[PDB]
Ligand binder design. Structure first.
Ligand SMILES: [Zn+2]
Ligand SMILES: [Zn+2]
Lengths: 118, 335, 248
C-alpha cells in the first residue's frame, strides 16, 4: 500500500487500468478498506468477502458477490443480517438465478426461481 | 465487616421484605436474591434488578446462567420481559449478545404491529450501546433506520410535505417484508402518496405487487378500483431524485442513498428527512446526539415538541449548526 | 462469430451459452462493450470473471443511472480502458471533453502527446501539464532536465528544492539572480541553501539581491570576513552595532 511507487510502476508498463485502480484506491480514506480492495485486485474474492464481513460491512460483501455472478452467495448472505433494501436484492437474485439456469436449458430449475422471484 | 446481622436480619419466617437485599451485602448472594431466581413468577422486579447487580459484581458462574434461565421463563413459563435480558447482558459486558437480544426484541415487537413502541425500545437500547461507546452492529443501525423511516412517514404526512413521505415510503416499501402486520395497508398509500406526489412510475411497480395474486383480494376496499386503474394506465413519469455531495467525500449521490459508491463508508442519516447528511448543515439534537439536516430540522420543528426520534422537548434555538463534523464523520475503519 | 460480425449481441450470447472456450467468451465480452450492449457484456464477463471490467461496466451503468447520456464518452472510456490510447483520444475529443484526454495522457505521462490536447488554453492548465511532466522527469532520476522543466512554470519552490537537493551551486546563482521581486521563500530560498552548500560565495549575495542586508551583513562574518562585515555594516550602521559585539 505505497500507492506512490506502484503508480510509477504502472506507468512504466503502459497500463492504464493499473493507474486508474491506483487512483480509485486513493479515493478511499480508510485502511482495511484499501486492504479489501487490493485482496480483490489479485482475485482472492473469498478472502475479500471474509474481510468485508469481519469489518461488519454486509453491504459491500453483497455488492461484491453481485458484481460477479455468485448469486447463490448473494442468497446465502441475504439469508442472515439485514440491509437497506433486502427484498429488492432478494427478488433480483432469484430472477438472476432463473436467467442463469434458463440460458443453459435447465428448466424445472429456472422454474423453481422466477417464482420466488416475480 | 461481614454484617451477619444484616445478612440474616429477619431472613427466617420464610421472608423478610427484600430478604435478597439482606443476603446482598457482601459475598456471593445466593439465598433470597436467588430465591427470586427460585420464584417462577415476578414476586418483585426489584429482586431481579438486584440480581442484575448480583451478576454486576462479575461473579461469572452458573448463577448468572440461572438468572438468564429464570429470565427466559423456560423453566418458569411466564417470563417477564427481556428488557432485563438487555440489562443483564450489559452487566457482564458481552455486548455482542446484548445487541443480538436487542435486535430480537425489536424484530418481534415490530413484526407484531407495535411500530412506535418498537422505535422507543430500539432507541433506548441504542442509547446505552452508544453511550458505553461499544461499536454498534450494522444490523441494529439498519433496523433503526428502516423502523424510523416509518415514523418520519406519518410526520411528513401530518405536516403536509408530499414528497418526503413518498421518499420514505419508497424505502419502507423496499423493506416491507420486515413489516408483516400492515403489508397491504403500508404498500397501499405507499402507492397513494407516490402518485399524489409525483413518483407514480414507482407506484406502478408497487401497486403491481399490491395487485399481485397473494396481495390481491385484500387491497383497500376504498380505492381498489383506482389502484387497478393506475396500474392499467401506468405513466412512466417520475420526477428525478435530487443529488447532493457525500459528506466525507466530495461526490454527488441521491438524497435517499446512504452507501456512497465512492468512499464506500455508510453515510449516517438525518432525523427529519431520512437523507444523507451534508457538511454544510450538520447538527444534532442536544439530547440524543443524532444527526439532522439543520435546515430540515428547524423546518420540521413546527411546534412538534418532542425530538423526531428521542421524543424529548425541543424548540427553535436549542439547535445550532456544527462545523467540526469530523467528530461524527471519522472514518470507522480509520477510527 | 457469425453473430458478432452482424452486431447481434443477444443472439451471440444465446449461442455462446451452449459451450465455448474462454477466449471466445472474452472476445464476445469486448465486442459487447464496444457495441454498447452492457447487459450482454455483464453476462459475458461474469462468465469469464474479470473484476476489473465488471467494475468498469458497473461504473458506467451507475453513471447512466444519473444524468449521463453521451455515447462517445462511454466508448472513449472503453477504448481507453482496454489500451488503445489513441482512438480513445479522438473519441474523447469529439465529445465535449478534451480535458478527459488530457488527464489520460498525463496519467500515462506521455506528455509529448498531451501537448496538443490543451484545447482550453492556459487558465492555470498549462502550469498543471508542465508540472506533471517535470514531476515525472524528476521521478525517473533525470534531475538536470527536471530543473528547467520546473523553471518554465511557477515552480521556483520546487526548482530551488531539487537544485539544492543536489546543489547546483553553478546554477542556483543564475536562477536566483534571474529570480526577482524578493519572494519570501523562493528568492530567499536559494539563499537559505547557499550557506548549506559550500556557497558563502553567494549566500550574502542573494539576500543582498533581496534586500535584508542586516542579518546578511552578520552572515558576512558568518563567512569569517570581519573586514567585509564592517564594510557592509557601513551600509547598515545599526547592523554594524548589532553584529560587531560578536567580533569583539
Ligand atoms: Zn462518499
Ligand atoms: Zn433528539
Amino acid at each position: 500500500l505505497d500507492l506512490y511507487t506502484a503508480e510509477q510502476a504502472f506507468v512504466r508498463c503502459k497500463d492504464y487500468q493499473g493507474i486508474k485502480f491506483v487512483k480509485r484506491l486513493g479515493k478511499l480514506l480508510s485502511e482495511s478498506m484499501k486492504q479489501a480492495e487490493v485482496v480483490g485486485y489479485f482475485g482472492r474474492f473469498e478472502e475479500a468477502e471474509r474481510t468485508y464481513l469481519e469489518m461488519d460491512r454486509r453491504d459491500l460483501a453483497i455488492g461484491l458477490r453481485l458484481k460477479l455472478g455468485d448469486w447463490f452467495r448473494v442468497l446465502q448472505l441475504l439469508k442472515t443480517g439485514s440491509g437497506d433494501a433486502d427484498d429488492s436484492l432478494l427478488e433480483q437474485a432469484n430472477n438472476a438465478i432463473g436467467d442463469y439456469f434458463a440460458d443453459r436449458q435447465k428448466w424445472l430449475n429456472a422454474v423453481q426461481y422466477y417464482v420466488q422471484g416475480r | 465487616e461481614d454484617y451477619q446481622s444484616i445478612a440474616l436480619y429477619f431472613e427466617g419466617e420464610k421472608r423478610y421484605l427484600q430478604a435478597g437485599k439482606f443476603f446482598l451485602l457482601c459475598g456471593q448472594y445466593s439465598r433470597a436474591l436467588k430465591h427470586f431466581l427460585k420464584c417462577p413468577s415476578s414476586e418483585d422486579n426489584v429482586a431481579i434488578e438486584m440480581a442484575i447487580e448480583t451478576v454486576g459484581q462479575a461473579k461469572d458462574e452458573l448463577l448468572t446462567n440461572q438468572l438468564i434461565d429464570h429470565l427466559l421463563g423456560e423453566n418458569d413459563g411466564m417470563p417477564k420481559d427481556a428488557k432485563y435480558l438487555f440489562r443483564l447482558y450489559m452487566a457482564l459486558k458481552q455486548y455482542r449478545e446484548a445487541a443480538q437480544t436487542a435486535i430480537i426484541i425489536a424484530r418481534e415487537e415490530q413484526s407484531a404491529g407495535n411500530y412506535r413502541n418498537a422505535h422507543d425500545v430500539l432507541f433506548s437500547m441504542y442509547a446505552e450501546l452508544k453511550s458505553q461507546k461499544i461499536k454498534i452492529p450494522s444490523e441494529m443501525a439498519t433496523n433503526l433506520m428502516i423502523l424510523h423511516s416509518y415514523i418520519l412517514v406519518k410526520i411528513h404526512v401530518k405536516n403536509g410535505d408530499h414528497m418526503k413521505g413518498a421518499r420514505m415510503l419508497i424505502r419502507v416499501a423496499n423493506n416491507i417484508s420486515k413489516f408483516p402486520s400492515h403489508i397491504v395497508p403500508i404498500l397501499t398509500s405507499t402507492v397513494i402518496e407516490c402518485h399524489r406526489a409525483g413518483l407514480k412510475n414507482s407506484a406502478f411497480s408497487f401497486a403491481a405487487m399490491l395487485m399481485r395474486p397473494e396481495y390481491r383480494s385484500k387491497i383497500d376496499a376504498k380505492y381498489k378500483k383506482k389502484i387497478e386503474g393506475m396500474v392499467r394506465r401506468p405513466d412512466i413519469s417520475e420526477i428525478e431524485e435530487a443529488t447532493t455531495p457525500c459528506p466525507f467525500c466530495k461526490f454527488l449521490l441521491p438524497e435517499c442513498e446512504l452507501l456512497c459508491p465512492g468512499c464506500k463508508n455508510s453515510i449516517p442519516y438525518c432525523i427529519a428527512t431520512g437523507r444523507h447528511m451534508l457538511k454544510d448543515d450538520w447538527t444534532v439534537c442536544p439530547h440524543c446526539d443524532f444527526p439532522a439536516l439543520y435546515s430540515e430540522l428547524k423546518i420540521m420543528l413546527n411546534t412538534e415538541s418532542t425530538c423526531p426520534m428521542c421524543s424529548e422537548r425541543l424548540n427553535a434555538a436549542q439547535l445550532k449548526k456544527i462545523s467540526d463534523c469530523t467528530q461524527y464523520l471519522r472514518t470507522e475503519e480509520e477510527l | 462469430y457469425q453473430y458478432l460480425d452482424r452486431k447481434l449481441f443477444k443472439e451471440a450470447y444465446q449461442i455462446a451459452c451452449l459451450g465455448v472456450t474462454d477466449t471466445d467468451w472474452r472476445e464476445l465480452a469486448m465486442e459487447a462493450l464496444e457495441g454498447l450492449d452492457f447487459e450482454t457484456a455483464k453476462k459475458a464477463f461474469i462468465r469469464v470473471q474479470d473484476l476489473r471490467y465488471l467494475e468498469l461496466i458497473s461504473s458506467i451503468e451507475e453513471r447512466k443511472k444519473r444524468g449521463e447520456t453521451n455515447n462517445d464518452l462511454f466508448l472513449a472510456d472503453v477504448f481507453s480502458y482496454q489500451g488503445k490510447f489513441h482512438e480513445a483520444a479522438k473519441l474523447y475529443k469529439r465529445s465535449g471533453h478534451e480535458n478527459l484526454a488530457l488527464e489520460m495522457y498525463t496519467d500515462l505521462c506521455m506528455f509529448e502527446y498531451a501537448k496538443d490536447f490543451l484545447g482550453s488554453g492556459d487558465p492555470k492548465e498549462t502550469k498543471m501539464l508542465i508540472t506533471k511532466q517535470a514531476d515525472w522527469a524528476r521521478n525517473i532520476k533525470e534531475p538536470k532536465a527536471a530543473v528547467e522543466m520546473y523553471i518554465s512554470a511557477g515552480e521556483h519552490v520546487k526548482a530551488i528544492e531539487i537544485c539544492g537537493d543536489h546543489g547546483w551551486v553553478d546554477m542556483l546563482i543564475d536562477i536566483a539572480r534571474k529570480l526577482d521581486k524578493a519572494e519570501r521563500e523562493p528568492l530567499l530560498l536559494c539563499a537559505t541553501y547557499l550557506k548549506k552548500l559550500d556557497s558563502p560565495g553567494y549566500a550574502a549575495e542573494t539576500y543582498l539581491k533581496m534586500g535584508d542586508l542586516k542579518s546578511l551583513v552578520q552572515l558576512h562574518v558568518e563567512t569569517q570576513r570581519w573586514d567585509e562585515a564592517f564594510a557592509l555594516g557601513e551600509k547598515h550602521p545599526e547592523f554594524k552595532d548589532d553584529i560587531y559585539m560578536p567580533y569583539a
